[PDB]
Design a protein around this ligand. Structure first.
Ligand SMILES: N=C(N)c1cc2cc([N+](=O)[O-])ccc2[nH]1
Length: 246
């Protein structure tokens, strides 16, 4: 997250921190995700496509810091790593960038809700807030485009919803953006998602309820003029989600 503010897991209790164990034992950060039910975390396919093997992955819930433990965190293995069959890699514009991780502890349990671990609601089908709506993004991603390191503390920021028409401008993203994608940016382009934020939640308040409206997917650079963050439009994948979480 470029700009924005530091936060803790109490303020995004569904946020999932996902890591991969390398051979030789090193564990590095992969991507964020969102807990939608006790046994299921939703993320982006592009986080996993290079390494599709579910045994390489570690998920944490209730975790506030990147390389240290948070009191009351839970640690999970991935019982199922489900990628979207119709995924595509553009140069930027990943189509169908949605993935589901079935989580289970070494003790055979799913998530147990608490002050730091809760689930997020899915939207109702094709029901998105109007452009100009303010939504929040959450992640451990880069704080400046030139940074080498990821921040140790979890961050959040607020970005505004950009209409499909506007994101379609040639001087924005043109045809790269589809109706299954959502664009969102800052009016001053000061704040944005960046490298490492992928898979994480875009949460909007939608008629009284915190809602997983999007999933961080791609963008050109970070916090650049006319170059918004792009998000998987969750309200367009509910059949996909409901069938696969069975
Ligand atoms: N604007 C976004 N929603 C977004 C930009 C972005 C960039 C990278 N990246 O640095 O490769 C990764 C994920 C991203 N998500």
């Amino acid at each position: 997250i470029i700009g924005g503010e530091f936060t803790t897991i109490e303020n995004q209790p569904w946020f999932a921190a996902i890591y991969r164990r390398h051979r030789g034992g090193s564990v590095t950060y992969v991507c964020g995700g969102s807990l939608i039910s006790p046994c299921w975390v939703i993320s982006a396919t592009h986080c996993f496509i290079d390494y599709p093997k579910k045994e390489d992955y570690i998920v944490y819930l209730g975790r506030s810091r990147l390389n240290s433990n948070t009191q009351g965190e839970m640690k999970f293995e991935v019982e199922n790593l489900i990628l979207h069959k119709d995924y595509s890699a553009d140069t930027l514009a990943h189509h169908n960038d949605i993935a589901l991780l079935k989580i289970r502890s070494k003790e055979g349990r799913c998530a147990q809700p608490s002050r730091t671990i809760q689930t997020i609601a899915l939207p109702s089908m094709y029901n998105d807030p109007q452009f100009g709506t303010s939504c929040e993004i959450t992640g451990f991603g880069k704080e400046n485009s030139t940074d080498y390191l990821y921040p140790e503390q979890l961050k959040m920021t607020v970005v505004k919803l950009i209409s499909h028409r506007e994101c379609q401008q040639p001087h924005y993203y043109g045809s790269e953006v589809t109706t299954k994608m959502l664009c969102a940016a800052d009016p001053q382009w000061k704040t944005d998602s960046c490298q490492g934020d992928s898979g994480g939640p875009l949460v909007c308040s939608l008629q009284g309820r915190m809602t997983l409206t999007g999933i961080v997917s791609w963008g050109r650079g970070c916090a650049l003029k006319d170059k918004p963050g792009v998000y998987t439009r969750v309200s367009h994948f509910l059949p996909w989600i409901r069938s696969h979480t069975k």
